[PDB]
Amino acid sequence: TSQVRQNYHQDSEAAINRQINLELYASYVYLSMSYYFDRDDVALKNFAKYFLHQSHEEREHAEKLMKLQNQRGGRIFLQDIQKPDCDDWESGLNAMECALHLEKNVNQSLLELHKLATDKNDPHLCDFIETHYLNEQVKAIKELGDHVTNLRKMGAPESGLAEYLFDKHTLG
Amino acid sequence: TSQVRQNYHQDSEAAINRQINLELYASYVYLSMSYYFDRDDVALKNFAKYFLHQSHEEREHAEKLMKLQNQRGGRIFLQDIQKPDCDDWESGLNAMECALHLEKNVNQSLLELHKLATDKNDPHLCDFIETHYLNEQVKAIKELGDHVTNLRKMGAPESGLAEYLFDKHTLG
Amino acid sequence: TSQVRQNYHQDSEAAINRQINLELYASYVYLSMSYYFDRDDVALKNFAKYFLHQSHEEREHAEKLMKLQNQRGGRIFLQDIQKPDCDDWESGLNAMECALHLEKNVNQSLLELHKLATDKNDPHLCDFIETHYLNEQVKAIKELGDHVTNLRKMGAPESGLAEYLFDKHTLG
């Protein structure tokens, strides 16, 4: 047992390891999305940059959870990082819709994590999740919803012109 | 009676209190408009910023009238600030059309106020209204008419692309 | 239903709309207070500035709640902003006592909002209220209590000298 461990339930430790994997998975999804828009037959450079930045942010999310695990005296256990569900993301709109669904799924996992931390009376872990994850998620979900809405109203995915102009004006 | 009061008719005092309420009402209309465009299913960020700035300007209008009331020795009497007529503003074009109608209504109130000040031979109040309100109104009405015209010619409200591009190029 | 909405109870949405109205009401109370001290027969310029700044802060409070409503996928619904209970605030001490009572009332509303968010297991909303409102309120209540105490010990409201000197040394 770790000399630093205090009020840190084994179930919370396990849940944190599951969350680490999920954040790394989200990083992988956004990495895949990014280079889809770098294809010569897609060629939306600011979509590509946007998703690559999101990919890097998700890796930071994972790293901060790994730091937390050690801070509390838990032990990191890593799993395979599953490949993303799509190889082909079809359109800027469809990728944004997938990212929205991804972020809502990660949010649900974080909310279940917070419920567990609450049930185990772990206020430090509750505050950690609230402080570093829950509002980040709300902002990410809101931004992706905003993007989806604009692309739809602009005429995407049918209008390749719309995706092009969104790439320049919103993501550029 | 106030030691500063001079040539300030009771009717003018009352009219100034009515104008204070109207300016606060205009501030509220623009506040509502602003956050309509912040909705995830509308998502026109520069419409939102534009109307929020207009909201703040209207509050300044109200404050300067409250200052005038005290400068002249009248007594401020506040009324409820009525909620705006619309919860849903439908489109960027429709919001601009509503703001145009609002500004023309506030202008009419200011012109009636000026007629009263003229009838009561209050040149200080006439100059105050002319100096700080009447040309501000003309410029605001002209700008909103310009915006309405551009949105119409661009294809709004049917073209969500038009509202998007107007948001970036004129309001951005 | 909003594409961004997740774990956001209809009751919380309604409570947030009620809180928006209350913050706008507080802004109106402080606006009224401010210009009372700008009257030529009151003439406490730093009381006036202090309350005007508080008025502007309350509008910011309202705006941040409107932003939150949209972030979470709720829909803003505005109500009339009621006029303040007093036209005449009588003295610097009495205005500070009224502001203290106002802030304690707004605090109670925020604490009921937090209880609801807790009952609905909304940790994001709990953190939002804690982060942006609850300590702001505690600090505001403490500052107003401090001011009330000083004015009382100085001899207010009987001593117009006390209110004058407090205006210069504490609010100036």
Next chain:
Amino acid sequence: TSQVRQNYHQDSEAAINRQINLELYASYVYLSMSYYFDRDDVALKNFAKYFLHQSHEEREHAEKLMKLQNQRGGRIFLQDIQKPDCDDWESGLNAMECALHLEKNVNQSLLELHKLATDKNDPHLCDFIETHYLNEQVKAIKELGDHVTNLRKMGAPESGLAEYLFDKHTLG
């Protein structure tokens, strides 16, 4: 009763006074530790500096709780600050082990305080404890565990060379 007091349970007030005493006690323990390493027969200058800084941080912890007590309208009640359990701390490793045990004890007190604030539905006090104390404690406990581990692996306490080199490279 205090004019500022709102939703602040008498039990919480008492618990905050107990925590104030404990933080002052921790300040005293670290003060004692510091000057032990300033002895001519111990002479580890960076151990001494490290613990003196920790001592000053604990006094700041106490002061912020005294500020909180007044912010919420409770009344500070001070008790004797007990002398530390050890006059002689024996070795750099043993002092770090004692500081680790101290911080875990203070953490437990803070977690009991948070449970009480939760039971009394005091979200402001919960947020205060989370924001200013609980992660500070986790970081302090982790750092002391790190230090203990390094000193042990280096060969302390038997190796006076290890304590000397740790003083220069980690604490210097």
Next chain:
Amino acid sequence: TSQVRQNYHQDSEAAINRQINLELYASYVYLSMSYYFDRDDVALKNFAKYFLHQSHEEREHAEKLMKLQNQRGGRIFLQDIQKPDCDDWESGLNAMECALHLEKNVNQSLLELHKLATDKNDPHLCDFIETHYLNEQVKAIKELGDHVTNLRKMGAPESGLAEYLFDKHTLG
């Protein structure tokens, strides 16, 4: 026996440990005083700042004596730091009168310490006390007497106005 010890009497060593405790006690008295003036029903912010600074100075006094003990090869022995005699300090004037009495008591202890160092022919300890403590005490006693005098002549403690104005002009 310490390798550095020279001409340092066991009685002086013990007296220095007693003085360390007394300086820490004075630090505690001023800490208590400080937060009394931070109460919402007292609310003299510059009294609070003044006494908090005095508290920090007393801790520095204690630390320099702990340094001296080690410099001379004595061994620090700590005792409980007794809580201050008053929880309620009643008025700015009464707190200043108590601080004056405190400083005169600490001065008497220092003068007895100096007599002992003289009797034991310890010129280094005599010079240390003279250099770092005796004139600091005289200046502190003179300043507190000055403050008491001004508060009395101003009309304190009856005049809450006097304490308020002293807070701004002398302590501000």
Next chain:
Amino acid sequence: TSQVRQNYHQDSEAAINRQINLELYASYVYLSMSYYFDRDDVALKNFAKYFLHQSHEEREHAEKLMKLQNQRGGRIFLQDIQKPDCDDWESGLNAMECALHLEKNVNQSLLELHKLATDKNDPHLCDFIETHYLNEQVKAIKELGDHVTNLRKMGAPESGLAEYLFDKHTLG
């Protein structure tokens, strides 16, 4: 078929996708290593920083291969990123030995990739591998061998002192 594709064999395209996975795997190994040294019972902060930087470099390696795939008109196909072979890396020396073995394995894959590009007469791909990977690998392998050698000669893994001092002087 891609409009940009020229002299790019399907076998090379597949090999590049295999290399992408391997570089992401190496990133994961170094991520795991990094946080092993962040454990409170290991606590070698510069080992942790060193491996985290290596992790980030490997992700850059992967990204540049994804860019190459698109530049040449191939299509990225991602696979699961396998978890690292070790959860526990035991010692600084053992982690360096594992990283050395990892880099030699990645080098072998790159050399097989280069042989394939040579056999398919793809000089652009040969130059890409030589320019951006092969000397990076040689330098990485040499540096890790240097580190292993120093740790062994210093007395690792038995000497926890050696690993501590290596952490400060070579990795610090």
